[PDB]
């Protein structure tokens, strides 16, 4: 099976830039399609962007342009970057195979001053 | 956006008895709309896949039905470990969007 799983930090500041790893095992990111997704602390689920198996993204206008989508083929990891973070991305942060099936363990992300 | 609407946002049931959980969608979506299933601090677990499509390893008392803007999760003779939030998904357009749940509680 696939496994996937997130790096990052467990607390940042406001206006910091937010960047996360999700490491994948078992399946390559060259081909499909690949997920960032975010459970807010009040159980809200939020789509946040994808990038296929060529490298385009896809991004939440909720976003407003603060996030970005990368990838390292040669490690067989996707990136996540959230710029000028507030209190409303504290979140429990998922990279997921586009399907649905197979999601990383997931990150807590708290925003706060 | 497609919007999607979940109602009830909370139902109580008793064990043993059935449900159906409603996700109505602002727009259609075709047969674009997924379940999840939502317990504490784990990731969402996928039980319904393209409006009715079963999928392996999750229990048969789960199944999804409807089209275009009404759709139904029916889980029959309800299990206390069934007890937790229910999301529906868009798949159809860009960006993809979650209904706000249901939460099934034990009456």
């Known amino acids: 099976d696939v496994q996937l799983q997130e790096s990052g930090p467990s607390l940042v500041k406001p206006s910091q830039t937010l960047s996360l790893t999700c490491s994948v095992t078992?399946?390559?990111?060259?081909?499909?399609?690949w997920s960032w997704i975010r459970k807010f602390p009040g159980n809200r689920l939020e789509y946040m962007g994808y990038?296929?198996?060529?490298?385009?993204?896809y991004y939440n206008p909720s976003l407003k342009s603060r996030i970005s989508i990368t990838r390292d083929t040669s490690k067989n990891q996707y990136y996540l970057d959230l710029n000028s973070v507030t209190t409303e991305d504290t979140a429990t942060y998922y990279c997921?195979?586009?399907?649905?099936?197979?999601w990383g363990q997931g990150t807590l992300v708290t925003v706060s001053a | 956006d497609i919007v999607l609407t979940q109602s009830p946002a909370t139902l109580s049931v008793t064990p043993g008895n059935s449900v159906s959980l409603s996700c109505r969608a602002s727009?259609?979506?075709?047969?674009?709309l997924h379940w999840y299933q939502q317990k504490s601090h784990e990731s969402p677990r996928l039980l319904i896949k393209?409006?009715?499509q079963s999928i392996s390893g999750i229990p048969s008392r789960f199944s999804g039905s409807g089209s275009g803007t009404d759709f139904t999760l029916s889980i029959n003779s309800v299990e206390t470990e069934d007890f937790g939030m229910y999301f529906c998904?868009?798949?159809?357009?860009?960006?993809?969007?979650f209904g706000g749940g249901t939460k099934l509680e034990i009456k």
């Open positions: 997921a195979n586009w399907d649905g099936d197979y």
């Open positions: 078992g399946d390559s990111i060259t081909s499909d399609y």
């Open positions: 990038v296929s198996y060529s490298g385009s993204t």
């Open positions: 727009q259609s979506i075709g047969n674009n």
């Open positions: 393209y409006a009715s």
């Open positions: 998904q868009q798949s159809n357009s860009w960006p993809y969007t």
